[model samples]
Target chain A: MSSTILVIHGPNLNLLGKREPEVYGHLTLDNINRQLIAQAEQASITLDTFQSNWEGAIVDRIHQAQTEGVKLIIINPAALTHTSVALRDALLGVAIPFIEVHLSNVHAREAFRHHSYLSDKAIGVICGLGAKGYSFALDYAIEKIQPSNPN
Target chain B: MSSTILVIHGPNLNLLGKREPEVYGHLTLDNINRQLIAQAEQASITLDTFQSNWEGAIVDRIHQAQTEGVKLIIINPAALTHTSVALRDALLGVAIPFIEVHLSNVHAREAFRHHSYLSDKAIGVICGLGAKGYSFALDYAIEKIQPSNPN
Candidate 1:
């Protein structure tokens, strides 16, 4: 039940490859998850992932992450980025640092996509970099949570 | 050349009292402004008010407030609450303290209406209190920025 890192995908992201091939590219959510799991495993990191369309479910997951001793979170809050204060409060309530990610450059898309309830609170934000954004966040979380080296 | 407080109304709020009497009530945006202006003048405080449908215009106004030596802002970000990081960046960029206001109980409305880009950074937030919210913010601002009493 314990994990070092938790990656959360919000709302319609489950339809990534099938939904917006032009905007989100052809990579399924599973594709991104597999890549992140492999990368984390190679580095001997315990990574957990979840995707949900409901806000309360996502909020519950963050609570579960806290109980599981999750040190950090990488979240692509999708449409929830502009809507869910519950998610914001959940992460803050748990006191876990997070990096926000986006498959598309949200800034270049709809004007409504520009504001985020979490970005200001996040350790960092990555967007428009495709699946690589998740990879980058995982890589950073791996390095950040690692034990200090004597060498 | 200087003002003590600035009130900002964003996006469609200009149509308040006119567009949705049932939702926003019969108090026009002008009605709210005149009331705030009079209240500030009564306390010998200088206040300026602005309403704009454009995000950049609101950003420019905040910058201008900095030059005018406005010490505090009371803002109702309207539809932009769900969007517009530019406004958030503008307020932070200027480093002026602000109070966020909402005429309706945004928590009681649409799910998207519940999150605010500015609320976390705000000195305080007032919602569901109607025009009285702005008045309350003004009262707080007056007390906050006033010279300390030598009792």
Candidate 2:
């Protein structure tokens, strides 16, 4: 029962609230992670979170997630969702299932924000629902990875 | 007026009808181009068409449009729509306004298809309406590039 979950935030996501409150909302990246961690703790699930502005750093973190026995990933690739195939490859290369989250309704924003390199492969995607999306993914992952209680 | 319009198709567009008629529709690339040309001819506007799988070739075409006095471009970058920043830069670099078209409703397709490198920069976009999308773009381009009639 060494199952764990990883949450990854990419490029400019660390500046979530300050960057554009009207569009990205006012929830800071740290605040989202804290909420996700608390949710996982209640379910007795091990949760780890990482955020980076660099593409290579995000790619490297996914590679490391394999070694960490991370069972599921909740990722909000932010701007990289529209541009980075490398990040997509790293996640697929690890063979770990993930959920893609977006703080804003990317489809409702600029046309460029509508496409994602990772969404097609993700087990599911949660967007335009803000930080609740991450908690929902974590909850789904917890249910999926947790062993059945033999009550 | 020596004004001209260019329709650029990218990567797999040549196989439009054959590839997946259910999704891409029954109109071949040539079919779309012929209709566009006829429409332009009726309006007494000059139009040209080009299609390529190579990203660099499409980029080159955009550059050539600049020298050819091509007033505007109607482009459907196919798979490159989701992947090519080079194409996006080329269109912007040429400073030619364009309308992006898709035979299929990309937004309704695989999650990856929902994003495009060129859509936001386009003067407008049309999709799911099939061959009509091209004609619609051509009609818009005609009105846009045409000089005001001195009635």
Candidate 3:
């Protein structure tokens, strides 16, 4: 069974720790990645993480994930979630299962934060739980990737 | 001061009350609008509500609100929240103070629902409280539009 999970982080998230402590919390991307890595190892899964501020770069990663045989993907496309049809097209094109995460509960924040274009295509979305959402999403993804048998 | 509020519902939401009752609850768009009108009257405000399935229509309404001198704008951009740069741009193009509302806690549902383009520009967003979020957003918008002076 393939155990690879591709994690993609987008835009301002690179400044997670220093950006907005009140809304986004104080964890750096590295800290979150480490937590995911630790959890992935516990589940005997291999996690590959990538971050990009460029829309094209993120799309390219999704394209690469298709041929690389990544079993699952977790993405925090940040600002792109509202503006990127190409990203949505890529995900739909690949037909791979992906989950969306946000450190802050976007709906509770600003009017603009309430819409998400990606929701139409994702297998699931986890948000507003800070870094812990990653763990939940990872667990859910793992369970989903693993086969279930009902006798 | 004439206090006028604009309530804008977006995308597939026009099919509310008949769409997915399990996810969107048992209220139709008219039911929600009626509740908003009642709430606005209680707060000494006038309500003007509109619903549209087209992205351009929502954007046009926001633009029109600017000329109409609407004091506060409440919007639930539905699926547009995730992928409509034109909508976000329209919101920005006008300096109207708007609140975003969602019937469901988008974050808890699907990953595609996690990213909101409107958050970057909205004064505030209200979500996860079902239809009650509409009232919360209205209350917040009122306070924002008319800040108290506790001298």
DockQ score of the complex predicted as candidate 1:
0.02
Write the residue-wise lDDT of candidate 3 on A68-93 in tens digits. 88988899888888788998899889
What is every candidate's C-alpha DockQ against the true complex, given to 2 decimals? Answer: 0.02, 0.03, 0.04
Among all candidates shown, the one with the greatest lDDT: 1
lDDT of each: 0.84, 0.81, 0.76
Residue A49 accuracy (lDDT) in model 3: 96
- How accurately is candidate 3 docked according to DockQ? 0.04
User: Candidate 3, overall lDDT?
Assistant: 0.76
TM-scores of the models, in the order given: 0.50, 0.50, 0.50
Clashes of each: 0, 1, 16
Off by over 4 Å in 3: A19-25, A147-151, B1-151
Pairs of residues at least 3 apart in sequence or in different chains that clash in candidate 1: none
Reference-based lDDT, residue B26, model 1: 83
Ranking, DockQ, top scorer first: 3, 2, 1
lDDT of 2 by residue, B1-151 (tens): 5668999886545545653323446777788788888999887888899986556777888889998878899998876788889889999998999999987788786676788889999999999888898899998899887745741
B97 in model 2: Cα distance from truth in Å? 0.8
For residue A125, model 2's alpha carbon misses the true position, in angstroms, by 24
Question: What's the TM for model 1?
Answer: 0.50
lDDT digits (tens) for residues B35-145 of candidate 3: 889987876777899998888778888899999888877889888898988988887788886767777666656778767788666655545545656765666555555
